[PDB]
Amino acid sequence: RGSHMRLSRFFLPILKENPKEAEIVSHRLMLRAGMLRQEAAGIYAWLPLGHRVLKKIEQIVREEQNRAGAIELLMPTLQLADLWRESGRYDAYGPEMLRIADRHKRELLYGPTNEEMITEIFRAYIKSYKSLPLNLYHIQWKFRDEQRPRFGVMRGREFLMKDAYSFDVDEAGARKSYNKMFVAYLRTFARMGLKAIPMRAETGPIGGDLSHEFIVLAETGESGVYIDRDVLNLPVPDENVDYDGDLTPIIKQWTSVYAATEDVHEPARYESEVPEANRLNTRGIEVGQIFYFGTKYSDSMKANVTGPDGTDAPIHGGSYGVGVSRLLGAIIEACHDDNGIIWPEAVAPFRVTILNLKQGDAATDAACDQLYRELSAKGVDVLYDDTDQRAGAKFATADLIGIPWQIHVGPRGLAEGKVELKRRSDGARENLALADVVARLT
Amino acid sequence: GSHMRLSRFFLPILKENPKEAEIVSHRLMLRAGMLRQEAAGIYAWLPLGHRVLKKIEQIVREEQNRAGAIELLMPTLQLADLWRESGRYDAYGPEMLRIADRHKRELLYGPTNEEMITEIFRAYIKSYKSLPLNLYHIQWKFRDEQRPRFGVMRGREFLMKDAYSFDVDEAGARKSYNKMFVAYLRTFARMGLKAIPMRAETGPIGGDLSHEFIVLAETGESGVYIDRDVLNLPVPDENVDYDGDLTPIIKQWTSVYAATEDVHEPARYESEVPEANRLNTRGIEVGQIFYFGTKYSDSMKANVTGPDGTDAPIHGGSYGVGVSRLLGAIIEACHDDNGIIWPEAVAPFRVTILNLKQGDAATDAACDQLYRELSAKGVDVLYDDTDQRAGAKFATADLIGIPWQIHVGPRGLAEGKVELKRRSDGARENLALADVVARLT
Ligand SMILES: Nc1ncnc2c1ncn2[C@@H]1O[C@H](COS(=O)(=O)NC(=O)[C@@H](N)CS)[C@@H](O)[C@H]1O
Ligand SMILES: Nc1ncnc2c1ncn2[C@@H]1O[C@H](COS(=O)(=O)NC(=O)[C@@H](N)CS)[C@@H](O)[C@H]1O
């Protein structure tokens, strides 16, 4: 039943020109488009339009974890360092890690991740191979005290993550739980119109020899990559994919082609198997990573189950992160033109925006009032720019904040019974009837 | 229409009562698999409990937006400096989580957001034509409490809805207060709480006008002083005109004696209220409104240009709801010897299908069918398909507080009937299957 919003009733501080302080296109637009505000180095406030988007992103991620079988919960932001000496990653994050002391001086910390929290929870409740496979997950704020925070949401200190965690009896199991997630990630980024490409990766302080990062190609990458062009026509699986079945063929299908970050690149291995014309070397933004770590946290923390053969054994685990806040940036770094942002439909803070091209005119007002109420009812997320500005000004803002569809309402069109519908993508227009428009959009 | 099978879930039911849990809300939340303590006063929300938190979240959200307030989100960590800028730097004393990063800069884990929302306001809003404006967010606050007691009712890490209003004068802020007031009335009623508005001390937040919202209890931490008569009054309906005149709604809620344990004046309680009406009892505060005027705008130089062409600092208020606390309260108000009694609006599921002869071809098929069909009609449904005995399923269902239970038993099903049970009062009704999937819709 349709999100709805008049601009006179809102909080969108658009910015004149380009903030001295922003180095890349995504940070600039987000600042310009009234989405974001820095409150500290790498710590941001999410202003209402920006918050609106973050939610859309959240919900997609959620839906897809859920479709893959994972169960949501929420862990707290602060964790006892005690937990961390137990697995002994106490010093694994180093300077990058934020330690706190309470009013009783108790080694706490703002959690950069939750491998140890989730294991502690798993071991409290789950005792039998029957309970498995299990995949708990949350979408919660993390803090990494990055040395030099940059690029806005892209490299910040307080940031949002969906982190999930899988729990199987043995190796062959977890290799399945791994693939579920792998597929679910393929869909996730695709539903946000981004071709995120699976690439072999390095586990860092998270353990394991299996890990893929998902990387969207760019012209500003924290990481540089070497791929074969063809990895870009590969199909993604549709909503009816059976996660309960054998997923190997898709995984095969998504790895047989050369894909590598610069961390695990091998040129001698590469020129071997690409035609010289498909080679696209380029930079990319890591939007997520998936890890299999066997018994890292289960061994040294005693996360055992009694298995089908009678005896106790530590479970085989994995973990999987999606940069939910980083996705805002990455999406914009891959969906913009000189006029501003171009949101893909699923993530747009509104589907359509009504631009009243002569405010205060009884006719345009009545016509815009009605479209807005009709569009809301048909369950369409609608922004009505009822502010008191001129045609060019309204076109400028509408472009900038990258709403997918624009409806233009003005004197000479409406006198004849027609408005104009502008698709932001390519910028194509059609003159069409006021009756029509609402139907054609829904 | 949200859907879950218990054999696919994560629901760690606890047998007895955990010895470390004094009040019932807490101990139930733990039995019901809703919660784990990770540190004193700090919690992980287990799947069942998160569902509920989210439904509470959403109820607050809806009424806030109906009241015309606008949602953003502020970060958890704030800079010390901001607090110097206002002189609340010392205001939370030892209840303040004070951090330093790898650069020796002083951060703090926000116990509230009055300054920051001012920092954001002063940055962008310059003209009185931009007001009234109310900005709210739902976000984890922190208070290092002396000794964290009573589970989610008095933790250190908690979830709050903190809303903040901005007006040009005295008059414009009353207007904005009044709205939230009405909005808080509708909010808690939507959880099936009688939350009673009472005059309150403003503490570190400041102000000479503040109403605290209290549900009556016995094992509650606040001492309260009203007269019984308040408990009848109407709760404004979903169709109020917020833009219009609310004062004669505030008048019938303010105007019988409502006072907490502070601000309580006794040679002033016996007089304004007659003999048989008086009642010294206790409660659980679940939200507080504050009007503070220029406390923060003065100090942080947040001015707008007014109607006459001059600058002046804005008049503010703030409005909070202890979202995570409400779980406690609701349970404390909604329970019996058998478990929780979730109000329809906040229940993690509306109905639970209990298969009373698990693995049996008939009852299975009949359950697989109801399940698929309620989900299809958008009814949040939980199928307890656990390989377990009848008594156990009844027990659990009761424990976790789902408002409706569907009992599918072999004899009952052998003739097209299934028993529907309302958890409130244990009303039952033997119904045909077609009958059941409707009805509940
Ligand atoms: N400083 C940061 N700012 C923004 N996003 C980040 C930051 N650090 C990580 N991310 C995002 O979060 C994702 C998960 O990060 S990760 O550390 O590589 N993997 C993990 O933490 C594992 N626990 C998987 S749950 C990253 O792929 C990236 O998209
Ligand atoms: N330690 C705590 N644990 C759980 N809930 C709390 C805690 N402290 C306060 N709350 C809830 O949060 C509500 C608002 O808190 S407050 O401190 O009175 N108000 C404020 O902080 C306002 N500045 C925010 S608008 C309280 O009415 C209470 O129900």
Side-chain angles (χ1 to χ4, degrees), chain A residues 59 61-72 137, chain B residues 4:
Chain A
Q59 183 65 15
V61 168
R62 173 171 295 102
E63 283 169 9
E64 298 298 346
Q65 296 294 130
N66 289 329
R67 200 197 304 284
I71 300 165
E72 193 183 4
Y137 82 92
Chain B
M4 191 54 59

Side-chain angles (χ1 to χ4, degrees), chain A residues 175-176 179 183 245-255:
Chain A
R175 287 206 151 271
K176 277 199 163 72
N179 321 189
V183 192
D246 184 30
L247 300 175
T248 327
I250 309 162
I251 310 297
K252 256 135 73 58
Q253 243 257 328
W254 270 90
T255 28

Side-chain angles (χ1 to χ4, degrees), chain A residues 113 115 144 146 153-156 159 161 163 165 206 286-289 291 319-323 326:
Chain A
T113 200
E115 272 74 10
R144 290 175 203 187
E146 211 44 60
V153 295
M154 294 279 236
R155 188 165 90 191
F159 65 107
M161 202 199 292
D163 45 305
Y165 302 108
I206 289 141
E286 170 189 347
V287 292
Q289 212 178 156
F291 308 73
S319 70
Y320 321 95
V322 175
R326 209 215 267 278

Side-chain angles (χ1 to χ4, degrees), chain B residues 88 92 111-114 143 145 152-164 184 205 212-213 285-288 290 292 318-325:
Chain B
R88 274 224 291 175
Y92 283 87
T112 186
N113 291 86
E114 270 80 354
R143 285 163 194 199
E145 231 130 295
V152 313
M153 307 255 278
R154 222 173 72 215
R156 295 191 281 162
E157 191 173 323
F158 67 83
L159 188 67
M160 198 202 281
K161 188 286 305 186
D162 36 313
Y164 317 88
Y184 271 36
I205 282 93
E212 221 157 52
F213 281 78
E285 105 187 29
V286 290
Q288 203 165 165
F290 299 101
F292 39 69
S318 75
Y319 321 88
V321 193
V323 190
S324 82
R325 177 136 142 182

Side-chain angles (χ1 to χ4, degrees), chain A residues 224-242:
Chain A
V225 309
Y226 309 72
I227 80 156
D228 177 316
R229 292 251 175 40
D230 285 305
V231 73
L232 284 173
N233 293 17
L234 306 185
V236 192
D238 68 296
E239 58 279 3
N240 296 148
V241 52
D242 177 302

Side-chain angles (χ1 to χ4, degrees), chain A residues 103, chain B residues 83 88-98 111 144 204:
Chain A
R103 67 185 284 163
Chain B
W83 293 70
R88 274 224 291 175
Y89 180 66
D90 285 324
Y92 283 87
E95 313 165 51
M96 253 230 211
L97 210 60
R98 254 163 179 148
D144 207 357

Side-chain angles (χ1 to χ4, degrees), chain B residues 39-55:
Chain B
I42 311 172
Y43 292 86
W45 304 73
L46 299 183
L48 189 58
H50 187 63
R51 256 84 167 4
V52 186
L53 199 83
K54 276 291 140 105
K55 307 233 150 217

